[PDB]
Amino acid sequence: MISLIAALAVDRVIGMENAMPWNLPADLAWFKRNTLDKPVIMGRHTWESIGRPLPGRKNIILSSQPGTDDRVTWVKSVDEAIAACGDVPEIMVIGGGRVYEQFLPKAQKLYLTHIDAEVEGDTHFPDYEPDDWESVFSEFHDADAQNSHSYCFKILERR
Amino acid sequence: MISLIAALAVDRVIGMENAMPWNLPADLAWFKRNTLDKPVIMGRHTWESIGRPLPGRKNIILSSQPGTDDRVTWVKSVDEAIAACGDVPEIMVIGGGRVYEQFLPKAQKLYLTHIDAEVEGDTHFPDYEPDDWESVFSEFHDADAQNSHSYCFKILERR
Ligand SMILES: CN(Cc1cnc2nc(N)nc(N)c2n1)c1ccc(C(=O)N[C@@H](CCC(=O)O)C(=O)O)cc1
Ligand SMILES: CN(Cc1cnc2nc(N)nc(N)c2n1)c1ccc(C(=O)N[C@@H](CCC(=O)O)C(=O)O)cc1
Ligand SMILES: [Ca+2]
Ligand SMILES: [Cl-]
Ligand SMILES: [Cl-]
C-alpha cells in the first residue's frame, strides 16, 4: 500500500529547494512516528534538505542523476523504487513535488499536515479531489512556544 | 567581559508570541560555537523555549520567580547572575529582551545574526548606537536547502 506524506502551506504550496519558512517540531515528530520502520521514497532536493539518511528507515532516492552515497538506495524510476522496497505493507513517499505527482494515482493514503502559513511558491501538492478520498482523522493544533504556526493533521483514505 | 548573542529579524525583532517562523540551523551552529564552554545567562521565557539545559555550558536563569529545575542555576539579580559565572573571561547573555536591556550597558561585544525576515514581533533588541560599535566580522549567506532565509553574521566590539 503506497502512502504520501506531506506538509502543505495555504494553497497547497510545498517546498521546491530552500527550507520552508516555519519551525514545526510537532510536524517532524508526526513525520517520524508515521515513517519509522518503513521504507521512504524521496527525490533529490528532499534528500539534500534532510541531509543524512533517516535512521530506522530504508532511504530510497529517485533521481536521474547518480549515487553520491553508499548508505541509501539510488533508483532511476518509479518501478525500480517500488521494487527496492520489498513486500511491506506500507510504502511512504515523502516528497518533493514531482515525486508526489508520480505516486499519487498509485496512492491509497494521504498523511497531510495543513499549515497556516502564507508562503510564496511555484510548487504545489498535486490536486486531489477530496471527494475520491475519506477523512479518517483530523486534529488541529494551535501555534506555541516551539511551533511557529497553527497546523492540522489529516489522514485520508482513497475510496 | 560580557557579550550579547542574538538573532534579529528586520526592525530588530527578537521574539513573537509563538516560535520564530524560520528554520536556521546555521544560526544554531553559530550560537553553539560561540557559546560552548561559557556560561549563558537567560530569562525564563527563553529557558522554557529551549526545553532543556544547553549542553556544555553553565545555565543561569535570571528570574524573580523561583526555580523549577535542578540542572540549572537560578538567580534573581543581575549581580548574582554575574557572580555565579565566576572568573571566566566572557559571559554570554542569550536573551530575551529585557535581559538584553539590563545587560546592554555592561556589554563589550555583540554577536549578531541579521535575518531577512519581515515579522510582527512582540519583543525587540534594544536600540544600540551604531556609531559606538565597530564591526570586526561580517559574513552573508543566502537561504539554502536547510536554512529558510538569508542571514548575516556580525561581531561588534564597543569603540
Ligand atoms: C526537509 N525534510 C523533509 C520533510 C519535512 N517535514 C515533512 N513533514 C511532513 N509532514 N511530511 C513530509 N514529507 C516532510 N518532509 C526533513 C528534515 C528533517 C527531518 C528529520 O530530521 N526528521 C527526524 C525527526 C526530527 C529531529 O530528529 O531533529 C526523523 O527521524 O524523522 C525529516 C524531514
Ligand atoms: C529558542 N532558542 C533561543 C535562541 C535561538 N537562536 C538564537 N540565535 C542566536 N544567534 N542568538 C540567540 N541568543 C538565540 N537564542 C534556542 C533553541 C534551541 C537551541 C539549541 O538547541 N541549540 C543547540 C544547537 C542546535 C541542535 O544541536 O539542535 C545548542 O547546543 O546550542 C538554542 C537556543
Ligand atoms: Ca570593520
Ligand atoms: Cl525533490
Ligand atoms: Cl526571556
Curated annotation (Swiss-Prot), chains A, B:
Changing M20 to I/V: Increases catalytic rate 2-fold. This is Dihydrofolate reductase. Residues 1-158 form the DHFR domain. The gene is folA. The strain K12 sequence is shown. Its EC number is 1.5.1.3. Changing C152S: Increases catalytic rate 1.5-fold. Increases catalytic rate about 7-fold. One of its GO terms (cellular component) is cytosol. GO terms for biological process: 10-formyltetrahydrofolate biosynthetic process; dihydrofolate metabolic process; folic acid biosynthetic process; folic acid metabolic process; one-carbon metabolic process; response to antibiotic; response to methotrexate; response to xenobiotic stimulus. The keyword NADP applies. It comes from the Bacteria. Key enzyme in folate metabolism. Catalyzes an essential reaction for de novo glycine and purine synthesis, and for DNA precursor synthesis. It catalyses: (6S)-5,6,7,8-tetrahydrofolate + NADP(+) = 7,8-dihydrofolate + NADPH + H(+). NADP(+) binds at residues 7, 13-19, 45-46, 63-64, 76, 95-102. It holds the Pfam family DHFR_1. It comes from Escherichia coli (strain K12). Signal peptide: none annotated. Substrate binds at I5, D27, R52, R57, T113. Keywords: Antibiotic resistance, Methotrexate resistance, NADP, One-carbon metabolism, Oxidoreductase, Trimethoprim resistance. GO terms for molecular function: dihydrofolate reductase activity; dihydrofolic acid binding; folic acid binding; methotrexate binding; NADP binding; NADP+ binding; NADPH binding. Belongs to the dihydrofolate reductase family.
